[PDB]
């Protein structure tokens, strides 16, 4: 569920055939008319302007959104040699194949809102019903339940659930109610609000989020707090640690190119070697520029080619070269590039391995990754440590707070 930004594109008609575009859809099927195929002649002309998936909403200023299929065809037929198209890219931004939380098929936001309202109204609060619902609904479904709750009760859902839930259970439920950008931005402000900084949390978010995720994060951070994320990062960091975080937080990393640039993979690997292990000291800006700007699939091969030049891998080299917040930052970044699910499985184990529980990290990883790569986090938590992530959550938490985390885990092993 996602409609892109509108764009005006002018096309031309070929002598053999026509505009060179196949279309499908219409108001009969409750779907817009979308370009399905682009011919090789008009492929080079419309490179970057029109793509398969664009929904033609206006033709020469005529709104063809609520129109049928053959009605839109006849408009393109009876047009001149050129047509100006207003298009909007239809994508499928919600969803992931490796999330543990599955979409509830018999979903009804009005019924779930009423069942939660009666669960809040029950004396002592029926937290079990609230947990069994919100932990088995996708984030997009939770927003619908919040809108249905306020529609029926004239009261915000998150404010009523804060009055009904307490402890770590409240933190889990209230975290699931925020959108991914809302939740990531709220956790970022928490790492910087005050006179100190939770570098462990600031590093975890900035190093692991992708370009698309960081774009919406920077947007909602300015909307919720009236300050750009880059300013607060600058105010809370310093030195080369500030440089690495501000650069990573831009989300302007190169997209994975269609070619495997072998010459750049060897040159980048040798550059990292010459900038650290080979020389006295470290060329920190060279390490920053390479690991922040290149794509992840490129840097994965770079780090393997780096094992050809250095007797220590990138992680071991980072330990021997830099220290403190800069070292920890680079270590988290390389883990996210090499194997991001293993990065999270390692952080989950560290949050529970000792006395007590670092609940701040356990909750955030279970909330933010339940619909991204939790299935991959689980498969490697079991592989490395011998027992399931379910087993560790079972041993480290109790009560309804345990039940919610095990729901976000999604199963044993």
């Amino acid at each position: 569920s996602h409609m892109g930004g509108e764009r005006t594109v002018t096309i031309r008609r070929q002598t053999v055939g026509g505009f060179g575009l196949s279309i499908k859809g219409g108001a009969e099927h409750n779907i817009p008319v979308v370009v399905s195929k682009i011919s090789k002649e008009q492929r080079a002309e419309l490179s970057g302007l029109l793509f398969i998936g664009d929904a033609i909403l206006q033709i020469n200023g005529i709104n063809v959104r609520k129109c049928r299929h053959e009605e839109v065809v006849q408009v393109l037929r009876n047009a001149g040699e050129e047509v100006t198209l207003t298009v909007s890219f239809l994508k499928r931004a919600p969803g992931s194949a490796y999330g543990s939380v599955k979409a509830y098929t018999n979903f009804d936001a009005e019924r779930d809102a009423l069942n939660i309202e009666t669960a809040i109204k029950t004396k002592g609060v029926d937290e079990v019903t609230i947990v069994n619902i919100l932990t088995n609904r996708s984030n997009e479904q939770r927003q619908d339940i919040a809108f249905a709750y306020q529609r029926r009760t004239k009261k915000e859902l998150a404010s009523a659930l804060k009055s009904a839930l307490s402890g770590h259970l409240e933190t889990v439920i209230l975290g699931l109610l925020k959108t991914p950008a809302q939740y990531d931005a709220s956790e970022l402000k928490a790492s910087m609000k005050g006179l100190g900084t939770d570098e462990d949390s600031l590093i975890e978010i900035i190093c692991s989020r992708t370009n698309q995720e960081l774009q919406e994060i920077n947007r909602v951070y300015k909307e919720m707090y009236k300050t750009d994320l880059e300013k607060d990062i600058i105010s809370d960091t310093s030195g080369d640690f500030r440089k690495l975080m501000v650069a990573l937080a831009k989300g302007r990393r190169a997209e994975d190119g269609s070619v495997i640039d072998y010459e750049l993979i060897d040159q980048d690997a040798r550059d990292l070697y010459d900038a650290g292990v080979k020389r006295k000291g470290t060329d920190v800006p060279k390490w920053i520029s390479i690991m922040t700007e290149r794509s992840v699939p490129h840097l994965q091969k770079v780090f393997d080619r780096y094992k050809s030049y250095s007797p220590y891998d990138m992680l071991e080299s980072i330990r021997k070269e830099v220290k403190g917040d800069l070292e920890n930052a680079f270590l988290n970044l390389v883990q996210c590039i090499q194997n991001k699910p293993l990065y999270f499985a390692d952080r989950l184990y560290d949050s529970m391995k000792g006395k007590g529980t670092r609940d701040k990290v356990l909750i955030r990883i279970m909330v933010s990754r339940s619909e991204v790569d939790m299935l991959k986090i689980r498969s490697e938590f079991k592989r490395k440590y011998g027992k399931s992530l379910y087993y560790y959550i079972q041993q480290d938490t109790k009560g309804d707070y345990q039940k919610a985390l095990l729901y976000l885990c999604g199963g044993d092993d």
Binding site: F19, L21, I23
Partner: peptide, 5 residues
Amino acid sequence: PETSV
């Protein structure tokens, strides 16, 4: 269906 131009 699918029309082509």
